[PDB]
Structure formats: C-alpha cells, structure tokens
Amino acid sequence: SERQAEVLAEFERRKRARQINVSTDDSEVKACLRALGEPITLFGEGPAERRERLRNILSVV
Amino acid sequence: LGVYLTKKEQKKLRRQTRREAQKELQEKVRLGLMPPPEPKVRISNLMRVLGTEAVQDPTKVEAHVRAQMAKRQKAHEEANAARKLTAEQRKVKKIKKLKEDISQGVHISVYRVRNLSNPAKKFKIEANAGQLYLTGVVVLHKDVNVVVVEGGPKAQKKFKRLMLHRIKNKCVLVWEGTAKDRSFGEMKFKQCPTENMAREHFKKHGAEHYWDLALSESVLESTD
Amino acid sequence: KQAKASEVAAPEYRVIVDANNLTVEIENELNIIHKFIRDKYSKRFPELESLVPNALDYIRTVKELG
Amino acid sequence: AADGSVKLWSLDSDEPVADIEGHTVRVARVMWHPSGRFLGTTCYDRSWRLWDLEAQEEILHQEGHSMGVYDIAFHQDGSLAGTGGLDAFGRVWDLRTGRCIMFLEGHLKEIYGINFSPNGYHIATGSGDNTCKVWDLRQRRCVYTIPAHQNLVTGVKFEPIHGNFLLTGAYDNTAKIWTHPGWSPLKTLAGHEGKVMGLDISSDGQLIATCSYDRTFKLWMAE
Amino acid sequence: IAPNLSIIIGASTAAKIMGVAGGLTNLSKMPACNIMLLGAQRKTLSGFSSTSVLPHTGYIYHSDIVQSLPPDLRRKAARLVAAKCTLAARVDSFHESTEGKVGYELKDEIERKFDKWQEPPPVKQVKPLPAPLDGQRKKRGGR
Amino acid sequence: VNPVVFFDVSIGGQEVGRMKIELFADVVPKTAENFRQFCTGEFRKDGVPIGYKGSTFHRVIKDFMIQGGDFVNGDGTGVASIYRGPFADENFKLRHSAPGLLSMANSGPSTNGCQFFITCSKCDWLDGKHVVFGKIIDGLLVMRKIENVPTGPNNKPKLPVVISQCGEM
Amino acid sequence: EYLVSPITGEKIPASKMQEHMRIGLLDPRWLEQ
Amino acid sequence: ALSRIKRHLLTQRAFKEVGIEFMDLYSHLVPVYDVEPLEKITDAYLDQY
Amino acid sequence: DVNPKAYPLADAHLTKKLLDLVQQSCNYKQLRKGANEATKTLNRGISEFIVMAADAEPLEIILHLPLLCEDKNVPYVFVRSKQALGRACGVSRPVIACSVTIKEGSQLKQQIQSIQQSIERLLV
Amino acid sequence: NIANTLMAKALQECPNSGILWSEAIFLEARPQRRTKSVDALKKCEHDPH
C-alpha cells in the first residue's frame, strides 16, 4: 500500500541526508540557502539548525 | 596538503559511524524492512537461549546453534579471502611496484670496491638491482670494481645499506649525487683489463668522471 | 659603580651583562664560603646545616651564634 | 646581511661608512667589480643590482632568472659577468652591451659556487646536486663535470694568479683540491667539525682559509 | 634590559630571576616550567606538613601579581605567569617591542585569565525531585 | 543592501502566504535592528528567542491600517524592543502616503515598540507621528486579505490572524 | 590556504580549518539533547 | 601493602582533607575525624608497630 | 613569505614528509610537543631535530630554539602553518614547536636520518 | 660556549664515554648538574668515572 511506500521513501531520504556534505562556513551556508530560495533564519534557529535545514533541502532536491 | 586528526577525533568519528549504523539497522527493523535480530547463540549460550527447547531434541538444537556459529564464521571469512586475493593482485603489481617516484631526479651512487672476484656477490648485486628496479652498470679492472647505481632515493638507500653492511678488499661509495636523467642502461657487467677501454665505455655514456675519480682514489690509496 | 654614578664607546650593555654574570660569580663564591663555614662549624654545631637550609641564613646564624 | 642592506665599511672604523639600500629580499652575495667602481649585489628578489662608488645608485637591475640569484661571478677582464640563480640556471651577461651571452644549463639543484677562471676561457659552476660543471667560454659548452663531494657544493674557486688548482668545498665537512684541466683531486682538507660554508685562497697561493659551520676558521698552508 | 618582562612582573622580581638564572639570554633559554622554580629555597618542614612549607615555589610565586590571588588559586597562577614571563624573555633577549607592546599584549591576557578564574560561578538551576513511579518499566536482562 | 524580512500570514489557521517586508536600515537603523532581533532572535529573556514570531494583528481597520505584532500583551498595548523598552523615532523623512509600508506603531512620541502597523492606504495624519520601519516588497495580496478581514469591536478581528513563521529573507 | 577535510574530503581553507573540524564531527544527538 | 606503607612513611608529607563531625553527648561535643582509608591503613599499622 | 625571517623554511614537498614523520613519531611516542619540551629535550641531549612553525605573532618565543640548537648541534626546520604542525603532532590546538627524541633501537632511525640530511641540504 | 658545543658534539658522536660524561658534568652549572645531567649519565653507563 501507500503507507509502506511513503515510509520507505522517507527512510531512504533520511539515509541520503546522512550522506551529504555541507560546508561548515556560516557565510557559505547562508549564501547557499539564499540561492536555494529559502529564508536564512527560521524563527531564530541556531546555526546547527540552519545547517540541518540546508542539508534536508539539498536532500529533497 | 593532507591533514591528520587527533586520536580523540578518530575515536569520536568511529563512534559516530558505529552509532549511525546501529540506529540505521534499528530503524530498518522498526519499519519492517528487516527481520528482528536473532539472539547470538554459542555452546555456552545454548542452554540459556534454547534451554526450554533443547530438552525436546538436543541434537537438532546443537545442529542449529553450530549452523548459526558457522554462518557467522563463514560470513566473516568470505570478504577476508576475497581481499587477500586482492593482496596477491596488488603485491605483484600495485603493492610492490612503486619505483620510488624517480621522475625528476635520479640518485646515482658510484662505489669502488677493491676485491670483487666472487660471482655470488655480483649475482646478489644484480638481483638487488633488478628487484628494486635500479639502473646502472659495473666495470671490472685490476683490483678495481666500479659499480654505479642510478635510481630512486629509497633504492639507493637500500643498495648502499646492502653493499656497506650486507656485503663484505673494501667497498666505499666514491660519488653519491643526483643527476638530471639516466645515463646507464640495464644492470650489466663489463670486464676491462685496460683503463682505456673502461674510460671509453664510461665516456660512451658520459660518465668518465666516475672512472677518473676511481683511478684517483686508487692512486691516493696506493700512495699513502 | 661608575656606570650607576654616570646616570646619577663602552655602551651600557656590557656593564649590564658583566653585572648579570657577576651575580652568578658571587653566588658561586658565596656557595664556596658557605661550604667552608659549614665545614668549620660542624665541629661547633654539626646539626645547624639540616636545621637551616639557606646558605645566607646559615651565615647570618653562625655570625649571631659563633 | 640577510635584511637586504649593504654595509660598506672601512679598514679602521668599526661602523659601516656607507649603507646602500634598495633591496627588500635577503642579499645573498655582494661582490665588487674588478675595475673597483661597480658592485654587483645578487639577492633573492630574482634580480641582480649594480651599484657604484661615485654614483651610489642602481646602475643595472638585471632580472631574468626564474628564482633568486644566489651567486654572481664576473670575468677577470670585467667584460662579462655570470650570474647564477636558484633555479639551476646561469646567465652570462655582458658588461658593455647589456645582454646575456651564455645560458649555463645542466645543473639539477641550486648553484651556490660560481667563479670565472683567471685564464679567461673557463667557468666553473657548483650546484647543490653534489656536482660541479666546468664549461668553456670559447667552446660554449660544458667541458667537464666534477663530482667532488656528496653534499651541496657551496664554495668553488680557482687560484687568483693562474688557476692551476680549484678548491671545491661542500657540506660534507671536507674540501677537495682538484686541478685546472682534468681537475684530478690532489688534497683532501678534512678535520672541519661542520659544513664548509665559505673558503678563500691567498693572493700568492700559499694559504687557504676555509670557514666551517662550527664557528671556526681553519687555515691550510704548505709544510 | 628587559622592558616587556619588567612590564609583566615586578622589577625587583625580574632582576632577581635574571640574577639567579645567569642572564637575560640564560633565562630566555630556560623552559617555562623551570623559571617558576628559580630561587626556590628548600625550606625544612619543622614537623609541619609539606604544604605549609609551600615547596616548588619560586620568585615568580612571590611576585606582586601572584600574591594578589587566593591561596587555592596561587600555584596555578604562578605557572601561567612563568609561561608568559618566559615569552617576554624570549622576546627581550632578541630586543623586540622595546616600548613593551608584547608586555601589554601578555599582561592583558594574564589579567583576563585571572578574571576568568576568579569569575563568580554561573546560575545553575536545581533539579526538582522526580515524581514517584508507578506501572512497569521494561528493564533488560543478560550478562 | 537593506535587510529583507519574511513573515508567513496565517489567518484562521489557513496560510495566506508569506509577506516579504524589507526594513529600511538607511532611514531607520534602529527599527531595522529591532526587526532583525524580533525576526529570529538569539537570547531575549533568559536565553529565549522572543520576538515577532507567533504574534498576531490586534487591530484591523479596513483599507486604513493593519496594526499588531504585540508579543507582550497581544492586544496592541505591548511595547518591547532591542533597546530594553520603548525607543525614540529614527527619522521623519519617511512618510506613510503609500500602501504596504509597515511603520512602528506607537501611542505617541518615543514609544515605538514591537507593535508594527502596515498602512493599507495613504494616511497623511500618520506622517511624522510614526516612522516607517520598512516597505512590503512582496506579499501584498496577503496584506490585502488580512486588511479585509472582518473586525469586531475596536477593530478586533473575529478570526485568528497570526504569524506562523518569521525570519530574514 | 586549502586543506582537505579528513572526515569530508573537500577543499576547505585553513583559516577556518580548526573550526571546520569542531563543527564537523558535531554529534546530532547533541542537537537532540 | 607493607611496601606502600613504607613508601608513605618515607616520602608522603602532604595528605588529603580529613572530615570532622561532632557527636553530641548533650554535655559536650566530641570530635570525630574522617580519614581516607589509604592513609588509615598506614596509620593503623604505624600505631600497632 | 609571511615570515621573511624564517631562513631555513621547508618547501611544500618537504612539509608533507616532515608531518608524516612527526605523526609516525607520535605513534611511537618519539615526539615532544611545545617549545618548553623541545628545550628540555635539547638540554637533556635526547632530541635529534626540531620542527617549528613560522606563524606566531610573538615569533621570538621560538627564536631561542635555533640558537640553542647551534649550541647542541641539532638541525632545525621551519613550517608554514602551526595548525598543520599541531595536527601532525596529534593535538587539535595549534603547535608552534615540536621535537623528535632518540630511542634505543628505534625503527624510525633511517627515516629520521634521511630527514636530517634534507635539513643540512636545506641550510644555505 | 664553543667548549660546550664541542662537548655536546662529542657526547652525540661518542656516547657511553665515562670520562667524557663525567667531564661534561663539570661543564654543566651546579643547578643543572644533579637535576638532569647525572641521572641520564647514570642511565647511559655505570663506569667508575
């Protein structure tokens, strides 16, 4: 059914997320996130949260 | 340039990778993609894991636990054997064929031995030159053995330690330096009783200065 | 003393260096003096060495004791 | 010095009389002209400057080497000057035309010892590759190669009277007294506790002073 | 003689340490862990403990800045000062920053370290006592 | 360049889109700094990113004004900024004669706090009383839908129109 | 400068190098905590 | 244990902090001292010897 | 470049071998980090060579080591980045000076000697 | 200083020399003789010197 398919899709999406390289420079991360079209800061998130958001966005695309 | 990492960072990276793999396996079990892991049973573990059922039919239980142990052991062995075949492969072509990076500079060591009448030492020197892929030549004359070896720095350091410590009338390096390109061909010997023939053979490749330095060293040894 | 009194081509650097070597020279000769005083006073008082470890304090002590 | 400033001092005053500046790189060599007026300074700025006594200005800042010029060797007549760089290259420039004549290629490491022969036809350049190339100025080719030692040769100079013998000094704590022609070695000056950095011969040729890396100067005289 | 090193510590202490060391060059060649041991008299314990003697304490330990610290913070302070003192010598022996710029650049960080060590403790929330437990909590078995 | 902010408008639980409002730091550096501190926030009250995130518009006068952003009281009486309380006006060079401009809403001089008022039309009486904190460069349809929301007594909207997310764009 | 991350294998400048390491191996369960 | 005791007798001069408590006898407060076991064994052997 | 005073500065090729040897010595516990430990080893006469970094704002804090080396007849070499030297030393914190120590019958001997020769080939 | 350099050179090139090591002690200053020289010297060899 669709439930197994979607949970497996999210499973390999997370697995891809764990295996994607993102630079540790905050400025470069900000520039990359701006290029991707998303706001740099999400309700005052921390830099680690910003890096995680960029990693997830890269994983989805 | 490549950068190392401290032992603390090595331990943390290994621990993070192992924890990542364990979480991956556990969440794979969560989603049903993987069967729940079976208890690891050995001979000592037998009566603890399958105690209530080993009394039903002990020999079948013994067979099952031995099959599990052998399955783990054989799983470990396959990869090891395949990568040991990989060892043979590289050792004969990728783990022993280096050449010491001799591309921009050839270390040339020319030594002058006094007594080299034994063919066993010449055969061992030829085997050491062929095993280390070091070029050069050898000229024989009256109480003179001019052995020039041009190659890499590690091959020259091995040949100097073999000729100075592993081979025994005295052997001393007359000229140890660097050259732009190679001058001598394969490791061969040339017997020249006259000094003019050895000088012409050295000047055919442009290495008459080594023969002149060997003659000057012999004259200095015979004078004092 | 002359260098000190001047400020009160022979630059001041050599005077400073020779003074900072004189301190070690006089420390060594004072160590010799203290050793000799210890050797002499061992007859009078063979225990004050362990009791008084400092050399200058030893010399002042034997001066005030005799 | 290594700061780039040249200090021209007198034989009586302990202070330098002239402070010739204009070089930011470390000044490797500074040699006066055989006429006595000019002075060639070779530094690590990949160029060679020329000063004068009555002018005290840059006469010719002749660049051209890929690396810094380590040693410079002028001719006995003063018509040519052979500047050797740290990129195993040696340019023989003309002191009357202002152009390079000979390219002293063939060395492997950086050339540290270069000195023209007093006969006016030979030129010996010693590099750090445990060799020494003696070339001919008339034949325009390398006449011989002299592997004098097994270390980096830093001092190579013949006799100032006739040049019948050449003193080759390397970092192997020993010097070799070769010869003008075949350069067959005659004397092995050993006993130095450190690397032979500099060496010089007398004007008559009876005493040779060779300094070492052990902060001592040793003279070798005939006995 | 030693502008930066005179800036770091007391002038009398600087003179004493150079005198016992043998010179500016002699002191600059010494390891930092050895300078703090300069002028450490072997005070004999008169039945008291070794801590009362305060052993392994040098002229740097008795300097002006080090003596202005609580005793529990003294020894450590000495070490720090010694290290920085060494740096000053390793500068002063080569005649650099004769105005004392390295001296200030080291004394300000010494003051910063002293402030950090003496800083008031931060605010730490207290853990409320956990609630009483009921039901069942799965606890594993095994070896 | 001028800092650009973004705020997702959520009216009645339904997202009407994000509103890109760039703060004019040249004419109002203090208001732009307060908007940057209230957009994401690092540590405002005991290490908590308090700001304009989660606030709602408490006053909605149709084709006149949309005032809100009060995170203290929620009814428009809250006054908070990065200067530890209310701050003075930056400059009077900016006018509210253009729709979409978000000014610092206040009850008088030197009382500009966290309350921001987006002008839905040209208000000549608001010029000089409140300084314009920024201009809406994008998302004017969400502001027009929030300004046309039904408002009850004292211009209080009967439907919850709050900001779901806020940050720097 | 330019250095290759031993844990990432990307060319990174040396000025941030040490910092690149510190936030390079940061454990995500620290974010969870 | 005896070797450690001898080493502590010969070299050890600085010791760890010892706690103090007071037994209340409602007439006087008797001091009770808490010493580390490592030093306690050495002191006990020393007392016995 | 950045440190013009560092006359015995190693090239890019030599730095890789130097750091590899430093890491190997750290594996064999034949390395002493820090200027004070290098000075202690030199005074003890147990070191063989010193690897120092050319980036340090009070640079003279390392300048005592070369002269002492000339007193003890020990080669010394300069390196560009202190962070790389510290990473080779096994310490994340930057290190400006490290020393390599002698052990009886050490397996690194030949490599040590090789690098030693290079330093003498680098001097002038 | 040159004597110390030569001494250091001699110790480096000729270890296990009892007379050289003992005379090197006498080169070393009193604060640096017992603390460091004699211990490594006894480690090197047990010559009557």
Resolution at which this structure was determined, Å: 4.4
Report D:178-207 residues touching I (Cβ under 8 A).
Answer: 195, 197
Chains C and G touch (3+ CB pairs under 8 A): no
Phi, psi dihedrals of residue A3, rounded to the nearest 5°: -65, -50
Report I:92-121 residues touching G (Cβ under 8 A).
Answer: 92, 94
Q: Pairing between strand B135-141 and B189-191?
A: parallel
- From the list F34, F37, F106, F112, the catalytic residue is F106
Rounded-to-integer distance, Cα F19 and Cα F163, Å? 10
Catalytic, F58? Answer no
E-strand ranges in chain E read: none
Contacting A with CB below 8 Å, chain G residues are 8-10, 12, 16, 19-20, 23-24, 26, 28, 31
Torsion of CA D123, D128, D129, D133, to 10 degrees: 0
Contact B130, B187 (CB under 8 A): yes
Residue B77 Cα distances to B37, B65, B90, B146, angstroms: 21, 18, 20, 53
From which experimental method does this structure derive?
Answer: cryo-EM
Q: What angle do CA E81, E86, E88 make, to 5 degrees?
A: 95
If one counts every other C-beta atom within 10 angstroms of the C-beta of residue D142, the result is 16
Among I16, I87, I114, select the one facing B5 at the smallest CB separation: I87
- Contacts of residue C24, defined as CB under 8 A and 6 or more positions apart, other chains included, come to E19, E22, E23
Q: Does residue E136 belong to the interface with chain C, where contact is any CB pair within 8 Å?
A: no
Rg of chain F over Cα atoms, rounded to whole angstroms, equals 14
Rounded-to-integer distance, Cα E10 and Cα E113, Å? 18
**Cα B121 to the center of its chain, rounded Å:** 23
Contact D96, D138 (CB under 8 A): no
Report I:95-124 residues touching D (Cβ under 8 A).
Answer: 120-121, 123-124
Q: Do B175 and D109 touch (CB under 8 A)?
A: no
Catalytic, F155? Answer no
Give Dmax over CA atoms of chain D in angstroms: 47
The residue written with tokens 């201009």 in the block is F135
Rounded-to-integer distance, Cα B14 and Cα A55, Å? 22
Contact C58, C50 (CB under 8 A): no
Q: How far is B83 from chain D (nearest CA, A)?
A: 43
Contact D139, D150 (CB under 8 A): no
Please give the structure tokens belonging to residue J47: 């010559």
Burial class for D152, CB neighbours closer than 10 Å (0-12, 13-18, 19+):
buried
Range of the domain at F17: 1-169
Residue type, F105: A
Domain locations in chain I?
A: 1-124
For residue H22, list its beta bridge partners.
Answer: H31
Residue I81 Cα distances to B16, G14, I9, I18, angstroms: 29, 9, 11, 13
Q: Does residue E41 belong to the interface with chain C, where contact is any CB pair within 8 Å?
A: yes
Rounded-to-integer distance, Cα D30 and Cα E106, Å? 41
Nearest to D71 by CA among D40, D101, D37, D38: D40
Nearest to D112 by CA among D64, D151, D164: D151
**Cα D201 to the center of its chain, rounded Å:** 13
Contact I49, I8 (CB under 8 A): no
Nearest to E63 by CA among E36, E101, E41: E36
Alpha helices per DSSP H over chain B: 7-30, 43-49, 51-54, 58-91, 119-131, 153-164, 195-203, 208-223
Please give the structure tokens belonging to residue B223: 């004078």
- The b-or-e profile of B83-96 (16+ CB within 10 A means b, else e) is eeeeeeeeeeeeee
Q: Do H14 and E45 touch (CB under 8 A)?
A: no
Burial class for D117, CB neighbours closer than 10 Å (0-12, 13-18, 19+):
buried
Chains B and D touch (3+ CB pairs under 8 A): yes
Type and span of the H or E element at F164: strand F161-168
Rg of chain D over Cα atoms, rounded to whole angstroms, equals 17
Rounded-to-integer distance, Cα I94 and Cα E25, Å? 26
Q: Do G12 and A52 touch (CB under 8 A)?
A: no
Among B1, B4, B9, select the one facing G25 at the smallest CB separation: B9
Type and span of the H or E element at D159: none
Interhelix angle E11-21/C12-44, nearest 10 degrees: 70
Q: Do I84 and B6 touch (CB under 8 A)?
A: no
What's the domain count of chain F? 1
CATH number of the domain bearing residue F77: 2.40.100.10
Q: How far is G12 from chain A (nearest CA, A)?
A: 8
CATH superfamily membership of I1-124: Ribosomal protein L30/S12 (3.30.1330.30)
Stated length of chain E:
143
**Which of left, alpha, beta for B48 (phi over 0: left; psi -120 to 50: alpha)?**
alpha
Please give the structure tokens belonging to residue C53: 């470890």
Closest residue on chain A to F165 (Cα): A43
Q: How far is E96 from chain I (nearest CA, A)?
A: 8
Residue type, B206: G
Rounded-to-integer distance, Cα C15 and Cα F144, Å? 89
If one counts every other C-beta atom within 10 angstroms of the C-beta of residue B115, the result is 13
Chains H and F touch (3+ CB pairs under 8 A): no
Could you write out the DSSP letters of every residue in C1-66?
A: -HHHHH-----HHHHHHHHHHHHHHHHHHHHHHHHHHHHHHHHH-TTHHHH---HHHHHHHHHHH-
Q: Do B28 and A4 touch (CB under 8 A)?
A: no
- Contacts of residue B57, defined as CB under 8 A and 6 or more positions apart, other chains included, come to none
Nearest to F134 by CA among F4, F10, F19: F4
- From the list F67, F71, F94, F96, the catalytic residue is F67
Helix (H, G, I), strand (E, B) or coil at E102: helix
Phi, psi dihedrals of residue F59, rounded to the nearest 5°: -130, 125
Catalytic, F71? Answer no
Among F51, F53, F169, select the one facing A39 at the smallest CB separation: F169
Rounded-to-integer distance, Cα G28 and Cα G30, Å? 5
Catalytic, F106? Answer yes
Residue C58 Cα distances to B186, C38, C45, E47, angstroms: 82, 8, 12, 20
Q: What angle do CA B2, B5, B6 make, to 5 degrees?
A: 155
Task: List CB contacts (< 8 A) between F39 and chain A.
Answer: 41, 44
Catalytic, F144? Answer no
For residue D74, list its beta bridge partners.
Answer: D81
Catalytic, F73? Answer no
Type and span of the H or E element at J30: helix J30-32
Please give the structure tokens belonging to residue E120: 């008031």
